[PDB]
Structure 1
Amino acid sequence: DELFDVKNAFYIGSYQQCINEAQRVKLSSPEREVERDVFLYRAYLAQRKYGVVLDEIKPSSAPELQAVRMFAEYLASENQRDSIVLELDREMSRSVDVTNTTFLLMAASIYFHDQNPDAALRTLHQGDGLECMAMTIQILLKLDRLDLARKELKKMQDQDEDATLTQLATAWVNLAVGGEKLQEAYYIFQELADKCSPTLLLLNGQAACHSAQGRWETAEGVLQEALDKDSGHPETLINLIVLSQHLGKPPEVTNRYLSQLKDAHRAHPFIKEYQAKENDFDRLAMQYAPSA
């Protein structure tokens, strides 16, 4: 696979690396060229550079790109989403085409955000690709059906044990499993970071593994390193808040990270949940509180 580096960089989480390499790579095939562009834009989406994707991908572009763009608009425009899903539903039902894997992944992604796990899973079921399998496992884990997840993992495991995508998948299942497994997950994350490069994604994964186990202090270094690279990184800040409390840092510290998160991303679901909790708490207070 010529694209191997580009894709691999993408999965690990080093988007810029993916973008840089994608450009360097030569097409050598109308097919490959399309795949390259797909990843290139996918990388931009990870970066959250929606405008880049929306502007550059134009109607004349290949359908694979179109799917990517579809996802991009979904992420970019909140208003557009219901309309997009409706169309997605229509396209999904009124059209058989399984072959376009990219379409399935993008479509599944939209459903995933839509929180229609069934639809996303339904779509993924059709897709053959290894990535489809990985995405499938991830959805199952969110579903909290580890058992189903395990089956898919082995499914991919038989196909390609060594693939990084497979390894990441195993780590995920692993993290979910708990127990001795956690160490296994830790090593895979560590190995990837060592081989490829510490990515924010990889660092947090390692931290999560350590945190799952008692080792709060060990976690400090990875988070600290991650924070240094990108302040405002959502996973990092959240982990820091959790880590800070275990460490016994001053309560202000936990608060500071939390506030920092709001600055970086007002929208972030973690923030929304936090707000939601505040609301019901007030609601509950009234319930218990004495009347006057």
Structure 2
Amino acid sequence: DELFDVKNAFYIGSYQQCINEAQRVKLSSPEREVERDVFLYRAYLAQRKYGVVLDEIKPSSAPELQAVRMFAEYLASENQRDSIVLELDREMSRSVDVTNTTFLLMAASIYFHDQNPDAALRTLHQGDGLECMAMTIQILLKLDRLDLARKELKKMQDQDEDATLTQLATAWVNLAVGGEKLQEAYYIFQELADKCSPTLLLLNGQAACHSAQGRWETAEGVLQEALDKDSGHPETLINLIVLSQHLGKPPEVTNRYLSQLKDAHRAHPFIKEYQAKENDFDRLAMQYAPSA
């Protein structure tokens, strides 16, 4: 696979690396060229550079790109989403085409955000690709059906044990499993970071593994390193808040990270949940509180 580096960089989480390499790579095939562009834009989406994707991908572009763009608009425009899903539903039902894997993944992604796990899973079921399998496992884990997840993992495991995508998948299942497994997950994350490069994604994964186990202090270094690279990184800040409390840092510290998160991303679901909790708490207070 010529694209191997580009894709691999993408999965690990080093988007810029993916973008840089994608450009360097030569097409050598109308097919490959399309795949390259798909990843290139996918990388931009990870970066959250929606405008880049929306502007550059134009109607004349290949259908694979179109799917990517579809996802991009979904992420970019909140208003557009219901309309997009409706169309997605229509396209999904009124059209058989399984072959376009990219379409399935993008479509599944939209459903995933839509929180229609069934639809996303339904779509993924059709897709053959290894990535489809990985995405499938991830959805199952969110579903909290580890058992189903395990089956898919082995499914991919038989196909390609060594693939990084498979390894990441195993780590995920692993993290979910708990127990001795956690160490296994830790090593895979560590190995990837060592081989490829510490990515924010990889660092947090390692931290999560350590945190799952008692080792709060060990976690400090990875988070600290991650924070240094990108302040405002959502996973990092959240982990820091959790880590800070275990460490016994001053309560202000936990608060500071939390506030920092709001600055970086007002929208972030973690923030929304936090707000939601505040609301019901007030609601509950009234319930218990004495009347006057």
TM-score range, shorter chain: over 0.9
Shift of 1:77: 0.0
State how far apart, in whole Å, the 1-side matches of 2:168 and 2:217 are: 24
Shift of 1:122: 0.0
> Where does residue 283 of structure 1 map in the other structure?
283
Shift of 1:206: 0.0
Shift of 1:173: 0.0
State how far apart, in whole Å, the 2-side matches of 1:214 and 1:25 are: 44
Q: Deviations over 1:11-58 (max 9, x none)?
A: 000000000000000000000000000000000000000000000000
Shift of 1:205: 0.0
> Where does residue 71 of structure 1 map in the other structure?
71
Shift of 1:214: 0.0
Shift of 1:104: 0.0
State how far apart, in whole Å, the 2-side matches of 1:137 and 1:66 are: 25
State how far apart, in whole Å, the 1-side matches of 2:188 and 2:248 are: 29
> Where does residue 45 of structure 1 map in the other structure?
45
Shift of 1:249: 0.0
State how far apart, in whole Å, the 2-side matches of 1:185 and 1:215 are: 14
Shift of 1:139: 0.0
Shift of 1:189: 0.0
State how far apart, in whole Å, the 2-side matches of 1:70 and 1:43 are: 15
SS at match of 2:214: coil
> Where does residue 228 of structure 2 map in the other structure?
228
Is 2:153 the counterpart of 1:153?
yes
Shift of 1:182: 0.0
Q: Deviations over 1:179-210 (max 9, x none)?
A: 00000000000000000000000000000000
SS at match of 1:28: coil
Q: Deviations over 1:232-289 (max 9, x none)?
A: 0000000000000000000000000000000000000000000000000000000000
State how far apart, in whole Å, the 2-side matches of 1:218 and 1:164 are: 25
Shift of 1:226: 0.0
State how far apart, in whole Å, the 2-side matches of 1:143 and 1:209 are: 20
SS at match of 1:108: helix
> Where does residue 132 of structure 1 map in the other structure?
132
Shift of 1:161: 0.0
Shift of 1:134: 0.0
Shift of 1:63: 0.0
- In the superposition, the TM-score normalised over structure 2's length comes to 1.00
Shift of 1:170: 0.0
State how far apart, in whole Å, the 2-side matches of 1:26 and 1:173 are: 36
Shift of 1:148: 0.0
SS at match of 2:99: coil
Shift of 1:143: 0.0
Q: Deviations over 1:89-115 (max 9, x none)?
A: 000000000000000000000000000
State how far apart, in whole Å, the 1-side matches of 2:255 and 2:233 are: 16
5+ residue gaps, structure 2, are none
Q: Deviations over 1:61-119 (max 9, x none)?
A: 00000000000000000000000000000000000000000000000000000000000
Shift of 1:60: 0.0
> Where does residue 199 of structure 1 map in the other structure?
199
State how far apart, in whole Å, the 2-side matches of 1:182 and 1:171 are: 8
SS at match of 1:2: coil
State how far apart, in whole Å, the 2-side matches of 1:121 and 1:88 are: 14
State how far apart, in whole Å, the 2-side matches of 1:127 and 1:281 are: 43
SS at match of 2:59: coil
State how far apart, in whole Å, the 1-side matches of 2:266 and 2:93 are: 36
Shift of 1:213: 0.0
5+ residue gaps, structure 1, are none
Shift of 1:217: 0.0
State how far apart, in whole Å, the 2-side matches of 1:97 and 1:235 are: 36
Instruction: Report sequence identity in percent.
Output: 100
SS at match of 1:128: coil
Shift of 1:157: 0.0
> Where does residue 265 of structure 2 map in the other structure?
265
> Where does residue 208 of structure 2 map in the other structure?
208
